[PDB]
């Protein structure tokens, strides 16, 4: 009986749920050629978090723990803690710690550390390759490449803050990251577990609607496109509201609040993704003050007004 | 049009509104001796954002713009844009661009840049000294100290991502940052404008309640304590709900959902800060699952149950 709704927020007011950066635009494209199975930004419309999804956007692609130096290298193994520094439990029924990256690529950021006895601190450039054999966050271990072979201490609180992505400029431009390729969360010690399911439009003539950002690039010629299935604020809002789904499909209209004019309509599926009636790869051009409005639950046969 | 409320979120599920990091604890202490006037994390209970507050946790202490430098210099001046890359208008009735840092200190992070013709990218260590004469975000310009004297291009999209704070280890430990000292947003040039007001308890025996985090340290012996008056999620929630204030004070109770018991009560003032009945500098020790819950609107001279 509690009524469903989505937040009154513009696209630019919202945040990507797969990296800590604002949304920029709405994009639609076919996706039959590849598997769409992101693990961050996954939530049902009645507020059940899925995959590796957690609530605050600043924890997305962050890691915390302590580090051990790999002798003869500038590499360090982080022994992960949970996002609140609690001991990490690998038997929890999740694919990896909440907020773990859900794509294969090279994420550059900064490893910072505090020494607890005296409050001394340090920071160094660091990169995590999430396709590495040594990317094993589900087992509590992640390897970082850094610019030091000596400065970090053992058993001291250490954090990785993500900044952006890189690419090898001597190879084909934009060939990485690969945002729809999941990592092996156990570094191939075993298969991935407890995943949010892959998504695909099932209705004739429909495509996914993607909430898109441009990740910062730190070196090379990376593919900076990053698409999420739900804005982080929608995850946060559905978790709070926990309104029951009266059918499997919520009908949303995208509206200009100055005029009341509806720009387009789309389907928000109960399991947490959006489709539109469109064929082709296109950016939507929108009014900056436009926002989504929930109008009606609809049945499995409802045909959207075509766009594009 | 529901009654006024606060979100059902634990302390650790929420985010500092003054730096993009999680909350860690609740802290109370006297503040009669200094000025408490932060500009981020400022919002009335009915959803009016104040100061430099905006909605995105990830934009707090971020800057966007393009950069120039004097030939041979490691210091780059950024000509600021708005957070969505729009032109920045210095005649807007705000203290500085939304999300500008609201304390004097040295914030270290990374300046990233993309060259639009070919998608080439670059990233460099960067520090902004918010006490500098060259820190003039209200005028549209700030300077970054970087580790390059040649590797940024003019007129290209450039972003500063914050990571943590630093201190000069050759001087008294923890002497900076100074979290309650506001920068001069227009440089040495003129006084600050359009500030969210200073806050103080007015009821006898009351103190402010602070939502506290520890900022990452990147070098030296910084003071990493960071207190905000409202979690970022409460700013987001009040903006979204916009419930009118029925008196000047909302009584909240902190509830342990493990037991049903109320641990303490506090006053949420309609202008956006919290007070408790206590004398002393003390950390609150809480159940991890504890959360705040609205109980009722109260008159101006309600007396809280004492704590501590």
């Amino acid at each position: 009986t509690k009524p469903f709704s989505v937040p009154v927020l513009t696209v630019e007011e919202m945040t990507n749920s797969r990296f800590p950066i604002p949304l920029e635009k709405l994009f639609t494209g076919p996706s039959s050629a590849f598997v769409v199975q992101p693990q961050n930004g996954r939530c049902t419309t009645d507020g059940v978090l899925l995959g590796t999804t957690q609530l605050s956007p600043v924890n997305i692609c962050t890691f915390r723990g302590d580090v051990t130096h790999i002798t003869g290298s500038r590499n360090y193994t982080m022994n992960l803690a949970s996002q609140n520094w609690n001991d990490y439990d690998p038997t929890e029924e999740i694919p990896a710690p909440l907020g773990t990256p859900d794509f294969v690529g090279k994420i550059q950021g900064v490893l910072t550390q505090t020494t607890r006895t005296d409050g001394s601190t340090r920071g160094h450039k660091a990169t995590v390759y999430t396709g590495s054999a040594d990317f094993a966050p589900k087992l509590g271990r992640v390897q970082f490449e850094t610019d030091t072979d000596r400065d970090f201490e053992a058993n001291q609180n250490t954090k990785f803050t993500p900044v952006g992505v890189i690419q090898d400029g001597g190879t084909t431009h934009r060939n990485e990251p690969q945002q729809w390729v999941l990592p092996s969360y156990s570094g191939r010690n075993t298969h991935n577990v407890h995943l949010a399911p892959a998504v695909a439009p099932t209705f004739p003539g429909e495509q996914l609607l993607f909430f898109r950002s441009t990740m910062p690039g730190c070196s090379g010629y990376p593919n900076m496109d990053l698409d999420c299935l739900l804005p982080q604020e929608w995850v946060q809002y559905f978790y709070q509201e926990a309104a029951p789904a009266q059918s499997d499909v919520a009908l949303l209209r995208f509206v200009n609040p100055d005029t009341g004019r509806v720009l387009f309509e789309c389907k928000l599926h109960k399991s947490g993704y959006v489709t539109v009636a469109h064929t082709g790869q296109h950016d939507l051009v929108i009014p900056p003050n436009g926002y989504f409005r929930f109008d009606s639950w609809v049945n499995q046969f409802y045909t959207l007004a075509p766009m594009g | 049009t529901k009654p006024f409320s606060v979100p059902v979120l634990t302390v650790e599920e929420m985010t500092n509104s003054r730096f993009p990091i999680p909350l860690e604890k609740l802290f109370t202490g006297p503040s009669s001796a200094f000025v408490v006037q932060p500009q981020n994390g400022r919002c009335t209970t009915d959803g009016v954002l104040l100061g430099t507050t905006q909605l995105s946790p990830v934009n707090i202490c971020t800057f966007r713009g393009d950069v120039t430098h004097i030939t041979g210099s490691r210091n780059y001046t950024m000509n600021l844009a708005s957070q969505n890359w729009n032109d920045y208008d210095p005649t807007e009735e705000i203290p500085a661009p939304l999300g500008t840092p609201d304390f004097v200190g040295k914030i270290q992070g990374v300046l990233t840049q993309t060259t639009r013709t070919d998608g080439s990218t670059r990233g460099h260590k960067a520090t902004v000294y918010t006490g500098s004469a060259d820190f003039a975000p209200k005028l549209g310009r700030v300077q970054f100290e970087t580790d390059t004297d040649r590797d940024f291009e003019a007129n290209q999209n450039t972003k500063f991502t914050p990571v943590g704070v630093i201190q000069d280890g050759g001087t008294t430990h923890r002497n900076e940052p100074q979290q309650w000292v506001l920068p001069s947003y227009s440089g040495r040039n003129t006084h600050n404008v359009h500030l969210a007001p200073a806050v103080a308890p007015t009821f006898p025996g009351e103190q402010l309640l602070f939502f506290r985090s520890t900022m990452p340290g990147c070098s030296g012996y910084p003071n990493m304590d960071l207190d905000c008056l409202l979690p970022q999620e409460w700013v987001q929630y009040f903006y979204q709900e916009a419930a009118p204030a029925q008196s000047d004070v909302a009584l909240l109770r902190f509830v342990n959902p493990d037991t049903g018991r109320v641990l303490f009560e506090c006053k949420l003032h309609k202008s956006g800060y919290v007070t408790v009945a206590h004398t002393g500098q003390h950390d609150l020790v809480i159940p991890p699952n504890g959360y705040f819950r609205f109980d009722s609107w109260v008159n101006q001279f309600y007396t809280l149950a004492p704590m501590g």
Epitope: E24, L284 | D66, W85, N86
Partner: nanobody, 125 residues
């Protein structure tokens, strides 16, 4: 996959007129803000004038307002820049740039995610 492509430049005669076109593909729904920039020798790309999705026009350089006209042809997904009475000061590489919004005419290059490769205008000696 958005694409912008400018055409219409060349070595042109003072006092003649010309028409640049900015052809776009890859957008749906609203009509995008489009702005013409130019880069004169030794300078950065500078914003000249802009047309919103509602065809509201903003000039960023006051000296061009007598002679430069921007317009939109929705049916051919093109925006034009017509220049009357060409003058040597008009000489530059001309770029069009687009935003995925119907409103917001901004003067700075960083406000635009999408760009063409440019067309050169040289008012000949």
């Amino acid at each position: 996959q958005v694409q912008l492509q400018e055409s219409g430049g060349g070595l042109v005669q003072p006092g003649d007129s010309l028409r640049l076109s900015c052809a776009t593909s890859g957008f749906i729904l609203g009509r995008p803000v489009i702005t013409w920039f130019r880069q004169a020798p030794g300078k950065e790309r500078e914003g000249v004038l802009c047309i919103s999705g509602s065809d509201e026009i903003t000039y960023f350089i006051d000296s061009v307002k007598g002679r430069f006209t921007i317009s939109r042809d929705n049916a051919k997904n093109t925006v034009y820049l017509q220049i009357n009475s060409l003058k040597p000061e008009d000489t530059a590489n001309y770029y069009c740039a687009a935003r995925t919004f119907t409103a917001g005419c901004y003067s700075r290059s960083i406000a635009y995610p999408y760009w063409g490769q440019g067309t050169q205008v040289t008012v000949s000696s």
